[PDB]
Design a protein around this nucleic acid. Structure first.
Ligand SMILES: [Zn+2]
Length: 41
RNA sequence: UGGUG
C-alpha cells in the first residue's frame, strides 16, 4: 500500500545541502546524513 | 526521539 513508516510534523525541516535534500525531524539541529546545520550557521 | 517508509 501507499502507507509506510514515513511521517510529517509541524517544525520539520529539509536539509539545505543540494547534495542531501534529506527530510529531517523537528528536534534535529543538523542533517541526518550530511550533518549540515538547520540554521544558516 | 516520528527515521528511511
Ligand atoms: Zn543533509
Amino acid at each position: 500500500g501507499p502507507l509506510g513508516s514515513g511521517q510529517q510534523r509541524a517544525g520539520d525541516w529539509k536539509c539545505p545541502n543540494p547534495t542531501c535534500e534529506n527530510m529531517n525531524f523537528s528536534w534535529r539541529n543538523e542533517c541526518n546524513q550530511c550533518k549540515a546545520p538547520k540554521p544558516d550557521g
